[PDB]
Structures are given as structure tokens and as C-alpha cells.
Design a binder for this molecule. Structure first.
Ligand SMILES: NC[C@H]1O[C@H](O[C@H]2[C@H](O)[C@@H](O[C@H]3O[C@H](CO)[C@@H](O)[C@H](N)[C@H]3O)[C@H](N)C[C@@H]2N)[C@H](N)[C@@H](O)[C@@H]1O
Ligand code: NI
Length: 275
């Protein structure tokens, strides 16, 4: 593919603060059927440039750690973006279109409880197909309780490790489908591949991906010369237990008391996001 598939894609400008009813209906219809929705033209260059720069500037500190935290296989580094006041942007944390969709899917009490990132390094390995958040009981069909909000901080290409997604996989929860790490058992993977094979496609910087937290996906090798930073948030239902995001009380004024909710603990000092 050369672009996000039309059936998963809704196009916007950074000026759009709400989806009209027909746009919201299509957004919800895509998330319900495919478990993944690509929103193009959401974020200004000004914001993505500063976040990209901050995360690449922090990568050296991350690679110096005694144990570099990875997801599954070499080269998929867990990296939190900074929570400096200067790098906490309302249009990223409290995006009005993102929360319009998450409010409609999860309810008005839904809250962001993740402010993290995935730095995919040059020469990274293939992750096993997994879900980031499990089904709440084995062998049970239930609606979503969490939505991953993924912000690419550079153009994602097939070369630099755009994520493999398995459309419609978010509703699959037969017995002995998942292991303790959330990896899909091989038997189920092959059966699914027959009827609905995975897709991988470019995603331009400025885009936002909203997906069911239970969607099957894998990180894949970054074959470029440059690390591929993703900023990651996750909206949960009110009743799902999550630790709070540590934020500086310098952002409490606009974060706390907003009707788009964040599970946050506000600290007096600077926060150390890296450990
Ligand atoms: N899309 C955002 C992020 O999603 C995932 O991070 C998740 C964990 O996966 C999840 O853990 C779940 O899975 C574990 C192992 O399967 C189980 O032990 C655990 N009980 C179960 O809650 C935590 N609750 C929250 C964390 N933010 C990815 N790792 C990461 O790449 C990505 O940035
Ligand atoms: Ni994952």
C-alpha cells in the first residue's frame, strides 16, 4: 500500500475541533468493524516537530540505561516523551476530535492513563503478533474498554517500521487464543490470516491512529537509518484500574477540570519521565 486504506481513513485539517454527525458515525463504524481508524491532518508541524526533536534528544539517555526496556524483541525501545510544561500540548493530550470519538465509544467518563512512546530503532527485529490490552475474560465477547491513540512523530513508511495491523481482530477472543504476554497463539493467527489478512501502510506525520486496545498488531523492522518515534496514549473506561500519569502541577490548571479526562497525579517539582 502507498497510503492508509480509504475504508480505515478519515481526513481532517488541524482547524477541525469536532466531527459533524456523519463523520462521527463513520469514525465509530470503522472502529466497531475494523478496530482501527486513521485520522489524517490532525496535528500541526509545529507540535510534531517539537515532540520528534525532544524524543530524539532523549534517546541517548535511554540507550545509556543498564537495562534498555524493549517490547518483545531487540530495537523496539519503550520511551516516555517529556512532561515538561513547554512540551505538553492541549491538542496532543486533550485533542477535541480524539475525545469526541473516545467519549462516544467508552463514555463521557473515559480517561487518558498513558503518555508513553515506542522508539523503533534501525535494524529492529519482528515482534510477535500481540494485543497491547487483553480481553477481560477468556472466551467472552464484550465491547471495547480502551482505545490506543498513536501519534507518529515522523512519516511512517513500509521501510521505517509502520505497524502491521490485523483489521477486525479486536472482537476475537476464543479459548486459548492468548498467552500471558498477550501474544496470539499460532493456530488462531493462521485461521484468521485465511479470512482477513493483516495490512501495513504509510501514515504521514500529522496523523492520529485510534484503535481498539485488543487489536492484533506487530512492530516490524525499521530498515531506515533513523529511529522511528511513536507517541502513545490510551483512553480507558472509568472503572479500569490504571496508575496515574505523573504531570507537573504547572499544567494542572488546564489538564484538571477539563471535560476530557486524564488520570493524572500533579507533582510540585519537575518530573523525571525517563526513570
Ligand atoms: N498502546 C500503548 C502501549 O500499549 C502497551 O503497553 C501497555 C501494556 O501492554 C499493558 O499491559 C497488559 O499486557 C501485559 C503483558 O501482555 C499484562 O501483563 C498486563 N496485565 C496487561 O494490562 C499495560 N496495562 C499498560 C501499558 N501501557 C505496549 N506495551 C506499548 O508498546 C504501547 O505503547
Ligand atoms: Ni503492541
Amino acid at each position: 500500500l502507498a497510503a492508509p486504506p480509504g475504508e480505515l481513513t478519515l481526513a481532517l485539517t488541524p482547524d477541525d475541533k469536532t466531527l459533524d454527525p456523519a463523520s462521527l458515525d463513520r469514525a465509530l463504524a470503522i472502529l466497531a468493524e475494523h478496530g482501527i481508524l486513521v485520522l489524517t491532518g490532525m496535528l500541526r508541524t509545529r507540535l510534531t516537530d517539537q515532540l520528534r526533536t525532544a524524543m530524539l534528544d532523549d534517546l541517548p539517555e535511554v540507550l545509556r540505561q543498564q537495562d534498555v526496556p524493549t517490547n518483545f524483541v531487540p530495537g523496539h525501545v519503550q520511551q516516555d516523551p517529556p512532561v515538561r510544561e513547554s512540551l505538553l500540548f492541549p491538542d496532543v493530550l486533550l485533542n477535541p476530535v480524539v475525545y469526541q470519538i473516545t467519549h462516544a465509544v467508552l463514555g463521557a467518563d473515559a480517561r487518558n492513563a498513558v503518555y508513553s512512546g515506542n522508539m523503533n530503532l534501525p535494524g529492529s527485529h519482528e515482534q510477535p503478533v500481540h494485543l497491547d490490552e487483553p480481553h477481560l475474560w477468556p472466551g467472552i465477547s464484550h465491547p471495547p474498554y480502551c482505545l490506543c491513540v498513536d501519534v507518529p512523530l515522523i512519516d511512517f513508511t513500509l521501510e521505517n517500521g509502520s505497524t502491521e495491523y490485523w483489521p477486525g481482530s479486536h472482537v476475537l477472543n476464543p479459548d486459548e487464543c492468548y498467552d500471558e504476554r498477550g501474544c496470539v497463539l499460532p493456530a488462531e493467527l493462521e485461521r484468521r490470516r485465511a479470512v482477513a489478512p493483516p495490512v501495513r501502510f504509510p501514515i504521514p506525520v500529522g496523523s492520529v491512529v485510534i484503535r481498539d486496545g485488543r487489536l492484533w498488531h506487530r512492530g516490524v523492522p525499521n530498515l531506515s537509518a533513523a529511529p522511528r518515534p511513536l507517541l502513545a496514549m490510551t483512553h480507558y473506561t472509568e472503572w479500569f484500574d490504571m496508575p496515574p500519569i505523573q504531570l507537573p502541577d504547572t499544567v494542572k490548571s488546564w489538564v484538571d477540570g477539563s471535560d476530557r479526562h486524564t488520570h493524572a497525579h500533579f507533582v510540585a517539582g519537575d518530573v523525571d519521565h525517563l526513570t
